[PDB]
Design an enzyme around this catalytic site. Structure first.
Site, PDB file in Angstrom:
ATOM      1  N   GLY A  70      60.674  71.815 -44.640  1.00  0.00           N
ATOM      2  CA  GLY A  70      61.641  72.226 -43.639  1.00  0.00           C
ATOM      3  C   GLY A  70      62.009  71.162 -42.629  1.00  0.00           C
ATOM      4  N   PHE A  71      61.377  69.995 -42.686  1.00  0.00           N
ATOM      5  CA  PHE A  71      61.644  68.941 -41.718  1.00  0.00           C
ATOM      6  C   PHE A  71      62.760  68.031 -42.218  1.00  0.00           C
ATOM      7  CE2 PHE A  71      59.843  67.146 -37.830  1.00  0.00           C
ATOM      8  CZ  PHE A  71      60.495  65.930 -37.793  1.00  0.00           C
ATOM      9  N   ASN A 118      61.868  80.156 -35.210  1.00  0.00           N
ATOM     10  CA  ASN A 118      63.044  79.806 -35.994  1.00  0.00           C
ATOM     11  C   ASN A 118      63.421  80.890 -36.989  1.00  0.00           C
ATOM     12  OD1 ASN A 118      62.934  78.818 -39.103  1.00  0.00           O
ATOM     13  ND2 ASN A 118      60.897  78.526 -38.208  1.00  0.00           N
ATOM     14  N   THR A 192      64.336  84.936 -45.133  1.00  0.00           N
ATOM     15  CA  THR A 192      65.138  85.419 -46.253  1.00  0.00           C
ATOM     16  C   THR A 192      64.708  86.850 -46.548  1.00  0.00           C
ATOM     17  OG1 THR A 192      65.460  83.223 -47.202  1.00  0.00           O
ATOM     18  CG2 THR A 192      65.675  85.124 -48.709  1.00  0.00           C
ATOM     19  N   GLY A 292      53.520  75.997 -34.427  1.00  0.00           N
ATOM     20  CA  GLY A 292      52.954  75.235 -33.338  1.00  0.00           C
ATOM     21  C   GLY A 292      51.581  75.704 -32.904  1.00  0.00           C
ATOM     22  N   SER A 319      48.526  73.864 -42.985  1.00  0.00           N
ATOM     23  CA  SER A 319      49.711  73.816 -42.133  1.00  0.00           C
ATOM     24  C   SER A 319      49.557  74.807 -40.989  1.00  0.00           C
ATOM     25  CB  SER A 319      51.001  74.152 -42.900  1.00  0.00           C
ATOM     26  OG  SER A 319      52.148  74.066 -42.044  1.00  0.00           O
ATOM     27  N   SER A 343      55.323  70.715 -36.136  1.00  0.00           N
ATOM     28  CA  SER A 343      55.452  70.834 -34.689  1.00  0.00           C
ATOM     29  C   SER A 343      54.956  69.581 -33.971  1.00  0.00           C
ATOM     30  CB  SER A 343      54.697  72.071 -34.204  1.00  0.00           C
ATOM     31  OG  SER A 343      55.388  73.254 -34.556  1.00  0.00           O
TER      32      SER A 343
HETATM   33  C1  LIG Z   1      62.582  74.588 -37.930  1.00  0.00           C
HETATM   34  C2  LIG Z   1      61.590  74.855 -39.034  1.00  0.00           C
HETATM   35  C3  LIG Z   1      62.026  74.921 -40.363  1.00  0.00           C
HETATM   36  C4  LIG Z   1      61.116  75.178 -41.401  1.00  0.00           C
HETATM   37  N1  LIG Z   1      61.546  75.251 -42.719  1.00  0.00           N
HETATM   38  C5  LIG Z   1      60.631  75.491 -43.741  1.00  0.00           C
HETATM   39  C6  LIG Z   1      61.027  75.552 -45.078  1.00  0.00           C
HETATM   40  O1  LIG Z   1      62.200  75.397 -45.422  1.00  0.00           O
HETATM   41  N2  LIG Z   1      60.091  75.799 -46.054  1.00  0.00           N
HETATM   42  C7  LIG Z   1      58.767  75.987 -45.733  1.00  0.00           C
HETATM   43  O2  LIG Z   1      57.944  76.205 -46.616  1.00  0.00           O
HETATM   44  N3  LIG Z   1      58.366  75.922 -44.425  1.00  0.00           N
HETATM   45  C8  LIG Z   1      59.285  75.677 -43.431  1.00  0.00           C
HETATM   46  N4  LIG Z   1      58.849  75.605 -42.124  1.00  0.00           N
HETATM   47  C9  LIG Z   1      57.387  75.828 -41.840  1.00  0.00           C
HETATM   48  C10 LIG Z   1      56.650  74.514 -41.616  1.00  0.00           C
HETATM   49  O3  LIG Z   1      56.702  73.773 -42.825  1.00  0.00           O
HETATM   50  C11 LIG Z   1      55.195  74.722 -41.217  1.00  0.00           C
HETATM   51  O4  LIG Z   1      54.547  75.399 -42.269  1.00  0.00           O
HETATM   52  C12 LIG Z   1      55.055  75.533 -39.934  1.00  0.00           C
HETATM   53  O5  LIG Z   1      56.051  75.125 -39.022  1.00  0.00           O
HETATM   54  C13 LIG Z   1      53.661  75.416 -39.322  1.00  0.00           C
HETATM   55  O6  LIG Z   1      53.283  74.084 -39.093  1.00  0.00           O
HETATM   56  P1  LIG Z   1      53.274  73.520 -37.585  1.00  0.00           P
HETATM   57  O7  LIG Z   1      52.521  74.527 -36.734  1.00  0.00           O
HETATM   58  O8  LIG Z   1      52.615  72.164 -37.637  1.00  0.00           O
HETATM   59  O9  LIG Z   1      54.688  73.406 -37.069  1.00  0.00           O
HETATM   60  C14 LIG Z   1      59.766  75.361 -41.109  1.00  0.00           C
HETATM   61  C15 LIG Z   1      59.340  75.293 -39.784  1.00  0.00           C
HETATM   62  C16 LIG Z   1      60.240  75.049 -38.748  1.00  0.00           C
HETATM   63  C17 LIG Z   1      59.716  74.989 -37.341  1.00  0.00           C
HETATM   64  C1  LIG Z   2      61.958  66.861 -30.439  1.00  0.00           C
HETATM   65  C2  LIG Z   2      62.235  66.644 -31.932  1.00  0.00           C
HETATM   66  C3  LIG Z   2      61.941  65.411 -32.602  1.00  0.00           C
HETATM   67  C4  LIG Z   2      61.329  64.156 -32.013  1.00  0.00           C
HETATM   68  C5  LIG Z   2      62.326  63.186 -31.506  1.00  0.00           C
HETATM   69  C6  LIG Z   2      63.723  63.403 -31.506  1.00  0.00           C
HETATM   70  C7  LIG Z   2      64.596  62.396 -31.007  1.00  0.00           C
HETATM   71  C8  LIG Z   2      63.992  61.227 -30.524  1.00  0.00           C
HETATM   72  C9  LIG Z   2      64.829  60.137 -29.992  1.00  0.00           C
HETATM   73  F1  LIG Z   2      64.572  59.735 -28.702  1.00  0.00           F
HETATM   74  F2  LIG Z   2      64.743  58.892 -30.637  1.00  0.00           F
HETATM   75  F3  LIG Z   2      66.181  60.339 -30.019  1.00  0.00           F
HETATM   76  N1  LIG Z   2      62.666  61.017 -30.521  1.00  0.00           N
HETATM   77  C10 LIG Z   2      61.853  61.964 -30.991  1.00  0.00           C
HETATM   78  C11 LIG Z   2      62.341  65.561 -33.949  1.00  0.00           C
HETATM   79  N2  LIG Z   2      62.850  66.840 -34.091  1.00  0.00           N
HETATM   80  C12 LIG Z   2      62.822  67.522 -32.873  1.00  0.00           C
HETATM   81  C13 LIG Z   2      63.276  68.928 -32.726  1.00  0.00           C
HETATM   82  O1  LIG Z   2      63.254  69.429 -31.596  1.00  0.00           O
HETATM   83  N3  LIG Z   2      63.702  69.732 -33.775  1.00  0.00           N
HETATM   84  C14 LIG Z   2      64.104  71.197 -33.714  1.00  0.00           C
HETATM   85  C15 LIG Z   2      62.895  72.016 -33.161  1.00  0.00           C
HETATM   86  C16 LIG Z   2      64.632  71.489 -35.134  1.00  0.00           C
HETATM   87  C17 LIG Z   2      65.968  71.850 -35.653  1.00  0.00           C
HETATM   88  C18 LIG Z   2      65.821  72.012 -37.054  1.00  0.00           C
HETATM   89  C19 LIG Z   2      66.689  72.362 -38.263  1.00  0.00           C
HETATM   90  N4  LIG Z   2      68.069  72.735 -38.444  1.00  0.00           N
HETATM   91  O2  LIG Z   2      66.048  72.320 -39.304  1.00  0.00           O
HETATM   92  N5  LIG Z   2      64.510  71.728 -37.305  1.00  0.00           N
HETATM   93  N6  LIG Z   2      63.790  71.412 -36.219  1.00  0.00           N
HETATM   94  O1  LIG Z   3      64.390  77.876 -43.505  1.00  0.00           O
HETATM   95  C1  LIG Z   3      63.712  78.759 -42.915  1.00  0.00           C
HETATM   96  O2  LIG Z   3      64.251  79.685 -42.258  1.00  0.00           O
HETATM   97  C2  LIG Z   3      62.195  78.805 -42.962  1.00  0.00           C
HETATM   98  C3  LIG Z   3      61.539  78.822 -44.148  1.00  0.00           C
HETATM   99  C4  LIG Z   3      60.187  78.894 -44.154  1.00  0.00           C
HETATM  100  O3  LIG Z   3      59.612  78.906 -45.188  1.00  0.00           O
HETATM  101  N1  LIG Z   3      59.523  78.953 -43.008  1.00  0.00           N
HETATM  102  C5  LIG Z   3      60.180  78.943 -41.827  1.00  0.00           C
HETATM  103  O4  LIG Z   3      59.565  78.998 -40.816  1.00  0.00           O
HETATM  104  N2  LIG Z   3      61.528  78.873 -41.819  1.00  0.00           N
END
Ligand SMILES: Cc1cc2nc3c(=O)[nH]c(=O)nc-3n(C[C@H](O)[C@H](O)[C@H](O)COP(=O)(O)O)c2cc1C
Ligand SMILES: Cc1c(Cc2ccc(C(F)(F)F)nc2)c[nH]c1C(=O)N[C@H](C)c1cc(C(N)=O)[nH]n1
Ligand SMILES: O=C(O)c1cc(=O)[nH]c(=O)[nH]1
Length: 381
Positions: A70-71, A118, A192, A292, A319, A343
């Site tokens: 998801g990153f 999210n 989903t 997180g 995770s 996170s």
């Molecule tokens: C914005 C966002 C989008 C994510 N998208 C997915 C995804 O597409 N597939 C998936 O398996 N997990 C997804 N995750 C879950 C993360 O991979 C991870 O399992 C979860 O955020 C817990 O890890 P953390 O506490 O280090 O953030 C997503 C999480 C976030 C915050």
């Molecule tokens: C803060 C943060 C960072 C660290 C960062 C960014 C910019 C800079 C810079 F200074 F160089 F510019 N430095 C460090 C990466 N990501 C986020 C973020 O907040 N992400 C949101 C929660 C998001 C949205 C979605 C999506 N649509 O999937 N998925 N996660």
């Molecule tokens: O893309 C998403 O909405 C998503 C998928 C997933 O597996 N986990 C999550 O937190 N978000």
């Protein structure tokens, strides 16, 4: 922390907390991906300690930290993210056809609790385009000896409107499978409709066996071709992991474990986001899964339960809530072989991998471990 390329260079922390305080999360994430796409993220110049390497079957992780799914959903800056100091990345989750996901705003951060909520909805470019992005990484890898040991898995899921998940899973295996070191089957997104129901034992068994059978058919049907089939790091067929949601009762957890033992899955990712957290004011009246720090205890406990329900036979990818070396050792001693961050990258930024690898190494010294593998599962007995 010397000069612009160092992940700990002092400016990144100042840019980061300014971003967290004043900049919408979608913009911050797009900025991070832009820097990565143009290969101007800092990079970790350290050579990792051999005493913190880890493995899941033939997957040899050069260090124990990867980036969770998801990153980098579309695989558009694999190289740059890895060069921050990570040993692997899980791209995805992908679906057969692209999709823009659910309505925005759908990302919300809480800096105080180092937490995210999210409702994204599997936004991705689709399996076919993401496959092209991964193929481009694999060609660069073939020519950059410095990436040749890094690992890339692919998380696969279903389009929102698909009726039989298995058709979409097969579709992804047949297009991107040959480029993946492992396949993560995502039956645990909270965003989903109906997806988590596939964690029922009967459905899950059929899903695992269909996925493994599709992978084994890929091989059978292309062994003899002039181009070698596995264009990945392992040069082997991808391993199969399942990613589990933490919002299950104990009977569901036991029944899933029984299925994982019978189907011979290669590992389990514990865990996805939780919908059970109610005590964060920022997130009141918000939909989706919480990531997180407030997921850490929940997911660590889940690791302990599943390590014991599978009688320690199923390797665990951790995770949830991992920011510090102590966090990582808690997951490992609980049963995990390897850790994923998400996170931590949001709240700690560029230094994430450098810092947590240093913290873990020192901690393995202070606790007398010869190496990380000696610590796996040591909470038990
Ligand atoms: C914005 C966002 C989008 C994510 N998208 C997915 C995804 O597409 N597939 C998936 O398996 N997990 C997804 N995750 C879950 C993360 O991979 C991870 O399992 C979860 O955020 C817990 O890890 P953390 O506490 O280090 O953030 C997503 C999480 C976030 C915050
Ligand atoms: C803060 C943060 C960072 C660290 C960062 C960014 C910019 C800079 C810079 F200074 F160089 F510019 N430095 C460090 C990466 N990501 C986020 C973020 O907040 N992400 C949101 C929660 C998001 C949205 C979605 C999506 N649509 O999937 N998925 N996660
Ligand atoms: O893309 C998403 O909405 C998503 C998928 C997933 O597996 N986990 C999550 O937190 N978000």
């Amino acid at each position: 922390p010397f000069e612009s390329y160092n992940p700990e260079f002092f400016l990144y922390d100042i840019f980061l907390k300014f971003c967290l305080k004043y900049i919408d999360g979608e913009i911050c994430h797009d900025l991070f991906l832009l820097l990565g796409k143009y290969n101007i993220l800092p990079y970790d110049t350290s050579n990792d300690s051999i005493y913190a390497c880890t493995n899941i079957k033939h997957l040899d992780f050069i260090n124990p930290f990867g980036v969770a799914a998801g990153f980098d959903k579309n695989g558009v800056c694999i190289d740059s993210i890895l060069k921050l100091g990570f040993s692997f990345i899980e791209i995805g989750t992908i679906t057969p056809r692209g999709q823009t996901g659910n309505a925005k705003p759908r990302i919300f951060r809480d800096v105080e609790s180092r937490s995210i909520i999210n409702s994204c909805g599997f936004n991705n470019m689709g399996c076919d385009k993401v496959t092209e992005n991964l193929i481009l990484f694999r060609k660069r890898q073939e020519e950059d000896k410095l990436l040749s040991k890094h690992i890339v898995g692919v998380s696969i899921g279903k389009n929102k409107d698909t009726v039989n998940i298995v058709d979409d899973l097969k579709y992804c295996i047949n297009k991107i499978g040959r480029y993946a070191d492992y396949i993560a089957i995502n039956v645990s997104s909270p965003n989903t409709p109906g997806l988590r129901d596939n964690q029922e034992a009967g459905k899950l068994k059929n899903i695992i066996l269909s996925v493994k059978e599709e992978i084994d058919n890929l091989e059978k049907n292309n062994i003899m071709n002039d181009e070698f089939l596995w264009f990945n790091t392992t040069k082997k067929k991808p391993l199969v992991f399942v990613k589990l949601a933490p919002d299950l009762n104990q009977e569901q957890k036991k029944e899933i474990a029984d299925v994982l033992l019978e189907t011979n899955i290669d590992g389990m990712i514990i865990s996805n986001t939780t919908t059970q957290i109610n005590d964060i004011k920022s997130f009141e009246n918000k939909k989706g899964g919480v990531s997180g720090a407030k997921l850490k205890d929940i997911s660590t406990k889940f690791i302990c339960e599943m390590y014991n329900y599978t009688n320690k036979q199923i390797p665990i990818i951790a995770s949830g809530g991992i920011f510090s070396g102590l966090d990582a050792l808690e997951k490992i001693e609980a049963g995990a072989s390897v850790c994923q961050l998400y996170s931590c990258l949001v709240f700690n930024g560029m230094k994430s991998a450098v810092q947590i690898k240093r913290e873990l190494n020192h901690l393995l010294y202070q606790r007398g471990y010869y190496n990380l593998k000696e610590a796996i599962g040591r909470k038990h007995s």
